[PDB]
Amino acid sequence: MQLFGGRYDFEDTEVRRSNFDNFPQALISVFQVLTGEDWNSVMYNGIM
Amino acid sequence: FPSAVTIKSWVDKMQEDLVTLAKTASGVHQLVDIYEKYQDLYTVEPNNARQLVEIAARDIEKLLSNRSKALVRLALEAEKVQAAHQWREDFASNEVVYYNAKDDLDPEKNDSEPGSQRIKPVFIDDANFRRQVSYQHAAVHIPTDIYEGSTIVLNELNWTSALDDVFKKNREEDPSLLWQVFGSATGLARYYPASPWVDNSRTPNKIDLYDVRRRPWYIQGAASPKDMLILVDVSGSVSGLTLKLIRTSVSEMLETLSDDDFVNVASFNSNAQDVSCFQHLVQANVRNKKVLKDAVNNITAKGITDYKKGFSFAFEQLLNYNVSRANCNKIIMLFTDGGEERAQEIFAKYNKDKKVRVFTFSVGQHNYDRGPIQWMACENKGYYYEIPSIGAIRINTQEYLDVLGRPMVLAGDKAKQVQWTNVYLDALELGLVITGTLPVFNITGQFENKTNLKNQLILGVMGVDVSLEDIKRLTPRFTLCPNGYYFAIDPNGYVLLHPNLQPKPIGVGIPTINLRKRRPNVQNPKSQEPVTLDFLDAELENDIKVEIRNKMIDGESGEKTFRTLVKSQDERYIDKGNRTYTWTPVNGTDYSLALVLPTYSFYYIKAKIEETITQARYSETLKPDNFEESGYTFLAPRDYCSDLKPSDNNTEFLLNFNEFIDRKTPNNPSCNTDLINRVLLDAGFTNELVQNYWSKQKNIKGVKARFVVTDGGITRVYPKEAGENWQENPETYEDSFYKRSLDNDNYVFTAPYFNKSGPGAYESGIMVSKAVEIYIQGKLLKPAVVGIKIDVNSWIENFTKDCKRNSDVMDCVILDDGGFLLMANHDDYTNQIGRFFGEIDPSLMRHLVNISVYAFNKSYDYQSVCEPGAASKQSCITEQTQYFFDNDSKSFSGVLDCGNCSRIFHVEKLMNTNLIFIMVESKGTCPCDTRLLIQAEQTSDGPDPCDMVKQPRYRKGPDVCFDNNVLEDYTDC
Ligand SMILES: [Ca+2]
Numbered sequence A: 001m002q003l004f005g006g007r008y009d010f011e012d013t014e015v016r017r018s019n020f021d022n023f024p025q026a027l028i029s030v031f032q033v034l035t036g037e038d039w040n041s042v043m044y045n046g047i048m
Numbered sequence B: 001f002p003s004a005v006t007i008k009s010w011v012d013k014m015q016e017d018l019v020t021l022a023k024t025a026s027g028v029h030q031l032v033d034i035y036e037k038y039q040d041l042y043t044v045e046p047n048n049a050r051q052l053v054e055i056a057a058r059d060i061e062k063l064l065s066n067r068s069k070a071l072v073r074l075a076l077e078a079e080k081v082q083a084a085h086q087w088r089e090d091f092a093s094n095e096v097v098y099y100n101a102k103d104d105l106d107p108e109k110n111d112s113e114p115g116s117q118r119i120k121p122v123f124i125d126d127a128n129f130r131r132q133v134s135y136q137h138a139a140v141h142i143p144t145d146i147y148e149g150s151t152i153v154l155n156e157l158n159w160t161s162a163l164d165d166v167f168k169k170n171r172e173e174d175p176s177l178l179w180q181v182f183g184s185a186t187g188l189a190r191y192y193p194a195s196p197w198v199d200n201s202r203t204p205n206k207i208d209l210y211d212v213r214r215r216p217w218y219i220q221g222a223a224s225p226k227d228m229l230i231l232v233d234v235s236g237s238v239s240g241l242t243l244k245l246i247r248t249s250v251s252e253m254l255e256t257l258s259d260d261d262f263v264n265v266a267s268f269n270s271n272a273q274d275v276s277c278f279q280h281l282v283q284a285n286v287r288n289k290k291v292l293k294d295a296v297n298n299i300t301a302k303g304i305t306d307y308k309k310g311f312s313f314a315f316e317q318l319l320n321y322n323v324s325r326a327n328c329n330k331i332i333m334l335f336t337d338g339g340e341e342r343a344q345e346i347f348a349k350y351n352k353d354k355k356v357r358v359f360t361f362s363v364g365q366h367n368y369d370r371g372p373i374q375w376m377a378c379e380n381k382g383y384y385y386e387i388p389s390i391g392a393i394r395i396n397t398q399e400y401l402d403v404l405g406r407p408m409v410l411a412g413d414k415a416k417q418v419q420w421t422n423v424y425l426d427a428l429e430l431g432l433v434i435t436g437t438l439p440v441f442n443i444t445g446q447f448e449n450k451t452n453l454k455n456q457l458i459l460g461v462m463g464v465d466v467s468l469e470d471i472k473r474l475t476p477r478f479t480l481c482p483n484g485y486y487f488a489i490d491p492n493g494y495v496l497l498h499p500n501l502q503p504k505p506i507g508v509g510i511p512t513i514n515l516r517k518r519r520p521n522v523q524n525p526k527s528q529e530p531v532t533l534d535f536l537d538a539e540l541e542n543d544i545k546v547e548i549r550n551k552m553i554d555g556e557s558g559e560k561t562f563r564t565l566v567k568s569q570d571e572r573y574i575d576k577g578n579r580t581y582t583w584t585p586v587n588g589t590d591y592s593l594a595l596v597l598p599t600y601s602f603y604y605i606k607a608k609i610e611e612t613i614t615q616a617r618y619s620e621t622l623k624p625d626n627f628e629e630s631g632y633t634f635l636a637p638r639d640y641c642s643d644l645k646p647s648d649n650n651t652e653f654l655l656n657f658n659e660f661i662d663r664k665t666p667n668n669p670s671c672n673t674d675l676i677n678r679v680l681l682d683a684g685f686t687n688e689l690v691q692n693y694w695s696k697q698k699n700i701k702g703v704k705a706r707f708v709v710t711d712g713g714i715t716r717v718y719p720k721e722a723g724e725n726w727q728e729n730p731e732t733y734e735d736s737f738y739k740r741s742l743d744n745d746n747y748v749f750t751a752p753y754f755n756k757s758g759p760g761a762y763e764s765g766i767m768v769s770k771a772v773e774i775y776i777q778g779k780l781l782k783p784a785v786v787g788i789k790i791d792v793n794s795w796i797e798n799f800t801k802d803c804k805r806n807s808d809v810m811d812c813v814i815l816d817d818g819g820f821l822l823m824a825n826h827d828d829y830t831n832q833i834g835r836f837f838g839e840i841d842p843s844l845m846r847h848l849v850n851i852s853v854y855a856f857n858k859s860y861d862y863q864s865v866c867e868p869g870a871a872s873k874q875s876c877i878t879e880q881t882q883y884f885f886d887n888d889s890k891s892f893s894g895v896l897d898c899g900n901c902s903r904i905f906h907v908e909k910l911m912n913t914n915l916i917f918i919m920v921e922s923k924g925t926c927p928c929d930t931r932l933l934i935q936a937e938q939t940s941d942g943p944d945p946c947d948m949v950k951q952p953r954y955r956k957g958p959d960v961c962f963d964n965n966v967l968e969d970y971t972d973c
Helices: A023-034 A039-047 B004-026 B028-038 B051-083 B151-162 B164-173 B216-221 B241-254 B286-296 B307-317 B344-350 B371-377 B406-410 B544-552 B612-620 B624-630 B650-663 B673-694 B736-743 B792-800 B842-850
Strands: B042-046 B139-141 B180-184 B189-192 B226-233 B262-268 B272-274 B329-336 B356-363 B383-387 B432-441 B458-467 B485-489 B495-497 B558-567 B574-585 B592-597 B603-607 B632-634 B703-705 B707-710 B715-717 B748-750 B766-771 B784-790 B810-816 B821-823 B854-866 B874-885 B892-896 B903-910 B915-921 B938-940
Touching: A023 A039, B004 B028, B004 B766, B004 B784, B004 B792, B004 B903, B004 B915, B028 B673, B028 B784, B051 B151, B051 B164, B051 B180, B051 B432, B051 B458, B051 B485, B051 B574, B051 B592, B151 B164, B151 B180, B164 B180, B164 B189, B216 B432, B216 B458, B226 B241, B226 B307, B241 B286, B241 B329, B241 B356, B262 B286, B262 B307, B272 B307, B307 B329, B307 B344, B329 B371, B356 B371, B371 B383, B544 B558, B544 B574, B544 B592, B574 B736, B574 B874, B603 B673, B612 B650, B612 B673, B624 B632, B624 B650, B624 B673, B632 B650, B673 B707, B673 B715, B673 B784, B736 B748, B736 B766, B736 B784, B784 B792, B792 B821, B842 B854, B842 B892, B842 B903, B842 B915, B854 B938
Parallel strands: B226 B262, B226 B329, B329 B356, B356 B383
Antiparallel strands: B042 B603, B139 B189, B180 B189, B180 B458, B262 B272, B432 B458, B485 B495, B485 B592, B558 B574, B574 B592, B632 B715, B703 B784, B707 B715, B707 B784, B748 B766, B766 B784, B810 B821, B810 B915, B854 B874, B874 B938, B892 B903, B903 B915
16 A cells, blocks of 8 residues: 555556555455465556 | 949830730720720619618528528427427337438338337438438437437437428428428437438448537527636546546537637646636637647646635636626536535635536546535536546536526526527538527426426527528629628627638647557547638738727628728739728628728629620620630639539530520520620620731730630630630639739739649740720729730740840849749749749848838638648648738839848839839859748748737627526536
């Protein structure tokens, strides 16, 4: 929530549900990187 | 360097030779004497320039009145028929049979969707429509992304089915009606006569985005003029996709504003500032809207939010009253995402009395609070909209005209007045039209006061088109010279009728395209703007025309004779001519009609040929096979009779015209007998001239073609071998040289074009013209123009016989008023005959402009076509320059010091023509050149509107204003 909190301000209509905006939505976005499922796309949003 | 006296004698002999050749070979005097020797085949009638304006104004008022009477009928029937509608919700067994336009015409589809049943029409072909129409039923247009079969749409298609008989009876009561349309608040548009839509949905590759609820006529007849103040939110939280949707939404919202509405775009993030260079409500015309859009597309998002600052700024912008406003609807549009401050303080401090509405748009997919925004919305009589994607923008940024229309409904029968739109281009390709609208009210249970919940909104708007070819027929312009004309005016400046209003859209700025960001199959949208061309932007602008304009905008009659610069047909010259503007108001409506007559045009010629033998004898002369005895004959494509139509292939037209005038007796039952009598009398006169004079000296030394262009379309070019070298228009009222040589009282040289593909330098020759001018009863007349094409070679050799061909001691050129090269002395100049002189000797030309021999005027053309820049064609503004003689003194001697050197020059104007002989030290002497002085349409973007709004043109506004009725509901948000 500090690193990528509110930084997903992309100017396209692509949807990104696994983001770190609030606590209930950062917990879900961390649990998914922990179960190693589609975690490589949560990294490309964090890098872009 | 030769002295002044020898040069004066040179130009004296040169001018004398030129003038005597033109006078003795064209035949001015002989045509004058034969125009004066008859005096019995015709009569001289006066143009009472006041009676004409009154008659034309009454004809226009009567036409618009007949179009009004066909609107209140439609609206009455629509209100009555919808009042008695029962709202069924099961349409399976009872099909709704109708003709959905933009459906396929192959007769083996048989769609018959659930609840609906189509029709296969017959589609005869028509005139007054450039397409195929069916007078049996009305067509329906349903926007692409609106399902046809929704119970809301199938109900409109039910109770609108009873409009078709009133459509039919209106049409058969007045067979010259164009489209009648009912455009309803559910997207539908039912128009008559039926005709397939121009863009089917996906049967072609392209999409149609036409929503009857965004059209100018609908948005006009659905509310009253506004004072909008779009208050964008550029806080940090709107960054991302919300900001993009806010930009697109503000643009699509501006596209719903007309020229009577005033608008400004603020922007707040812990500080409220304007978004552009304006700082107060501006008039929302095409240029101001372009400025606002280009400034909104640069918005960036960063900071904290503060609604109190933004609303203080908005409410303080809506209280200026130092500027011109619409003074009717004060609304604030807040484009935001979500917040927590509702700020009751500011709404109590500024609109405790609720004069300013608030519409709040919450944009994007976010997780913020919207309670405060809905509260602001439906606390201040406003409304609340949600815009989550690009697809909902077009539908949410147009639906506030349901809120703004409540007072117009609670006003009732007082609020039903027909009002006419700006000039715009028809959506079914009819050209330029104006549409008259009248709203339709929903009255269910009106004698017992039952619901009044759906009965606050209108149903739709009823409109009916009036083409501008319908108005240009009530102002017939063929008893005036090529120079006089009618023109009308809005109570806004904008022009409704003019000789300089073209069917193209009004251009803004400089066109820029990025070809490298457009997929080949994406179907870009095109345009929606009206053709709003101000009156001062169609002509040249004195400060006496500003006076006439501001005097006829407020419905005054009068007359004014003065002297003005007039720009020739081809935008290359300028003439100081006298004019007489006589104007009057059109009583029924808010237009004003003026007539421009040049003195020498207060009398015209009326044919009186009644001895049918003379008629037949004259009509014999315009037959192709005897051209070798009378010269190539062109005939202007005017509508003499109902049957034949202008052909654009003048041989086709001359053949049809001859076979017509002999195919029907001279009785003339259905023919415009005055036009035809004049044309035949004219042909007789011209043929007598050609036979008695041009036939005797079959060939002269310098002449190449001797022609006569007159009133009645008759154009005669003597050697048919020169008839193939006539690039002029056959309609003599569009011949640039004709209108030019009517103004001047002497000979006029028309410098040919340069580097344009065609026979233009040596095969054709240089054109010289003079206007025949006769006195019948002490009354001036200028009925014809006689001319000559001078051979370039004979002129060169008479020019040389100290100037020698390809000399290098000096240069000796001949230019005209306009600075175009005619006869040079260097064989490389002479190669480029017809080019602007400032393009082949820029230093001398700038100096000439400086020493005040050549004055110049600059203007803008707002409907031009250009190749887009880098940042098929687009529409563009082109600046046009035009040079002319200002000082009437002849000789000008001097010397230009072009830096460390100086070349001496002497210029002398050949009197009795428009020619100027220049003799200068050679250009090889001084190796100086600043830069070319181009006279051509240079694509520009000015004037800067950031400065025109500080001191705008005069304008009057509509005085009916329906806002703030106190029995409203406003329990909606
Ligand atoms: Ca996986």
